[PDB]
């Protein structure tokens, strides 16, 4: 009855540190952090539990980060790509010599992620069980007319604050800005192709152009999810709250709203961090422009 | 691997400390849990994730950790609290 629960992106917001975000493994830990809470914030006795429910979710999102204990040294060696590529040290060190080196093995990282995926137990699934367990521990009468609290708590204390934060940063403008930056760097590439060709760091520009193009497509993809531009009627929360319904319906519709916040905050956390990385290496594109001493 | 002397049975008044020694490859990287044993009757969980309360169990019990040292720390003893209290932790080096 209750219908319970595709890329993987890598991130270097700063130059020096790297993390990855496994898209299924974040929506999951989001779904059941937006379910465990819903249950306890319906019932009065369970208002006591929210310290423990918080500290549970905290300690799951920490054991998860302990997987990044040995997907770390190879990550750091992957970072030493930037050492060889963009800042050749002491000015003296010199074509697809670094493109191959121990440097193709972005796949080495992707391996080590999948090497410790299901392996090492099931810290995901833990969140499923606990969120479901606390969803079982419910009361009210469960007659024809049950109370619609629960959802309204979580909305106005977690959701409604963040929706304003996103609408304030009009993403439609953000995309069109990023498009134009990419367009101009492509046009300059067209011309630099037609002109130059020695000690060729145009290939670096081609490479960084390529990298920033896919990163754009991801941010573009996430932004479309966050604001679709064909909508349920954007209302949904209003349909849920300030009413009474039968036990079956409300339980489905808790799980309904529990799903939305999973995928929403997934894409929106990613979008924000990807945007910080785009303009980290848009400034590194502009560092090469600062190396046009001519 | 872990160590623990048997004494949870003297109750004039105050809290109580159960210390727990260990090593790098066990306490140092892994999350500790704690259990109470009423003699000749099923054991019960109090603390998991180093310090978190099971649904029903009192806050008087509390776990802790500092490097290669952990401790269970009860506060406000009772007749019920006189028992045997054991811990649970994993050891990466010997795998068990």
């Amino acid at each position: 009855q209750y219908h319970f629960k595709n890329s993987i992106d890598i991130l270097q917001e700063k130059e020096g540190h790297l993390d990855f975000v496994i898209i299924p493994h974040y929506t999951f830990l989001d779904y059941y952090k937006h379910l465990s809470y819903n249950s306890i914030y319906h019932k009065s006795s369970t208002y006591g539990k929210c310290i423990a429910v918080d500290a549970f979710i905290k300690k799951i999102n920490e054991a998860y980060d302990k997987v990044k204990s040995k997907c770390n040294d190879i990550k750091n060696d992957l970072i030493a790509t930037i050492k060889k590529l963009e800042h050749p040290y002491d000015i003296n060190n010199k074509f697809k010599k670094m493109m191959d080196e121990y440097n193709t093995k972005k796949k080495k990282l992707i391996k080590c992620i999948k090497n410790h995926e299901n392996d090492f137990n099931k810290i995901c699934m833990d969140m499923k069980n606990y969120g479901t367990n606390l969803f079982e521990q419910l009361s009210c009468y469960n007659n024809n007319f049950c109370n619609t609290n629960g959802i309204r708590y979580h909305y106005d204390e977690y959701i409604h604050k963040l929706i304003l934060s996103v609408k304030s940063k009009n993403l439609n403008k953000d995309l069109s800005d990023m498009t134009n930056i990419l367009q101009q760097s492509e046009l300059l590439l067209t011309n630099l192709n037609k002109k130059m060709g020695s000690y060729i760091y145009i290939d670096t520009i081609k490479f960084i152009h390529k990298e920033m193009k896919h990163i754009f497509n991801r941010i573009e993809y996430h932004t479309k999810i966050i604001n679709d531009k064909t909508k349920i009627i954007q209302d949904k929360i209003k349909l849920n709250i300030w009413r009474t319904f039968q036990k079956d319906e409300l339980l489905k519709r808790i799980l309904d709203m529990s799903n939305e916040y999973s995928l929403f905050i997934t894409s929106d956390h990613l979008r924000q961090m990807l945007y910080n990385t785009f303009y980290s290496k848009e400034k590194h594109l502009n560092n090469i422009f600062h190396h046009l001493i001519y | 691997a872990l160590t623990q002397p048997p004494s949870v049975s003297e109750a004039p008044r105050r809290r109580v400390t159960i210390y727990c020694s260990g090593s790098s490859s066990n306490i140092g990287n892994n999350a500790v849990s704690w259990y109470q044993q009423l003699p000749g009757k099923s054991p019960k969980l109090l603390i998991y994730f180093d310090d978190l309360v099971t649904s029903g169990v009192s806050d008087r019990f509390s776990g802790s950790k500092s490097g290669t040292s952990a401790s269970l720390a009860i506060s406000g003893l009772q007749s019920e609290d006189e028992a045997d209290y054991y811990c649970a932790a994993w050891d990466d080096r010997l795998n068990g």
Epitope: F56, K59, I60, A63, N118, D119, N121, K122, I123, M125, D126, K128, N129, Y130, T132, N133 | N30, A31, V32, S33, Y35, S42, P43, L45, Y48, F49, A88, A89, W90
Partner: nanobody, 120 residues
């Protein structure tokens, strides 16, 4: 209902076969981790083994390694523990431990227990 019902367990001569069991209901057995824990008379607790929701991972201690065999049928909600080449150190009450929602070292609940004594 919080049910962990042991079946079997008894006495067999050194180097015997003995298969322990459990049953459960209410809490959906397939979705959660199980374990085994043992306690010898006049001795404290000792972890035996751990299993997965689909029996992907299996793990044991460092003495009965290869001897014991943890298994489960998740259609009938039933843990097992085939224990071959039995020794006398293996004298214990074998509790069908279940682990908590939170995967770790974490015996959520404990069954009544199966007395397994090993002697001539």
């Amino acid at each position: 209902e919080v049910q962990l019902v042991e079946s079997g367990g008894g006495l067999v001569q050194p180097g015997g076969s003995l298969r322990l069991s459990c049953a459960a209901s209410g809490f959906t057995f397939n979705t959660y981790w199980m374990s085994w824990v043992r306690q010898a008379p006049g001795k404290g607790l000792e972890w035996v083994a751990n299993i997965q929701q689909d029996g992907s991972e299996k793990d044991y201690l460092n003495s009965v390694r290869g001897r014991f065999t943890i298994s489960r049928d998740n259609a009938k909600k039933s843990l097992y523990l085939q224990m071959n080449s039995l020794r006398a150190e293996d004298t214990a009450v074998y509790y069908c431990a279940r682990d908590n929602p939170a995967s770790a070292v974490a015996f959520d609940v404990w069954g009544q227990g199966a007395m397994v004594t090993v002697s001539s």
